[PDB]
Design a protein around this ligand. Sequence first.
Ligand code: U2Z
Ligand code: U2Z
Lengths: 149, 149
Amino acid sequence: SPGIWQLDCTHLEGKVILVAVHVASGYIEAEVIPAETGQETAYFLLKLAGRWPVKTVHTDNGSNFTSTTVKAACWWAGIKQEDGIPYNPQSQGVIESMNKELKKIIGQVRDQAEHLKTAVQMAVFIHNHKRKGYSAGERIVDIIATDIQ
Amino acid sequence: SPGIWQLDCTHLEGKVILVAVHVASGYIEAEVIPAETGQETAYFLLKLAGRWPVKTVHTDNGSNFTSTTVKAACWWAGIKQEDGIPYNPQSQGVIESMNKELKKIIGQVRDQAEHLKTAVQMAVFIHNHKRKGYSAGERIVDIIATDIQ
Ligand SMILES: Cc1cc(CO)nn1-c1ccccc1CN
Ligand SMILES: Cc1cc(CO)nn1-c1ccccc1CN
């Protein structure tokens, strides 16, 4: 469970926001992309896995699960590619709630930012620092550190 | 020291590679950008600080130190902006050695990847996972976790 991530794709301003959630902590990384292609998803996973110890990724949909390019990136980066079927039904609600929260924060910034990508990274910052009391950023580091030891 | 990062800008294929190094661990994040502007550097720092607890950044040059946009990003993200003057002269050598190493890895993968940005992220992955025996990725998490506790 320290190495389990879930992909999530949401839309805003006619643009695509690709999100990776560290399931145990709620910590996220995100990027704005023109469209969710296998290539874009593969590149995003490469970046993620160079930065955190990504053991398993639950893909956000069947197209990214099927994608040879995504499979190739998972092979390259040593990631077990899995489906994202909500066997525990609460998983749908959790992801939906996060997308709502993220969009709310995006709305709260951007009087401040010209470009959506800046607003999305501001939202990532606020989400990961928010105390709920530890933050998601604190939880992910503690979870992974405990695993190392 | 858990929160201290150093910026580093290096060049390859007529392109700019912007690197942030976590000084205590040797862990890095990097991106390819068309040119090192204040705007690009500011955005890079925003991304970094949303992902790791960035307390202090030693800027890579005087232009980024001076930049109002970089100063604004540091304000936004709660980062202390500092110079990168090598008061300890070994710091020059360390950064140069890292740039050499990074370019070497890029060369080793360059044929697997069409685009330089992909090769750079492969290099980030290899660098952060390399056992020296802990990896830089392991060291950064342990350093920050110990600071939290
Ligand atoms: C790791 C990764 C990211 C992307 C997409 O940018 N492709 N791969 C990949 C995967 C396997 C082989 C070659 C490549 C490079 N094309
Ligand atoms: C945090 C950050 C990154 C960048 C550059 O993309 N600017 N800022 C910034 C900083 C302060 C205010 C508004 C903005 C938004 N322009």
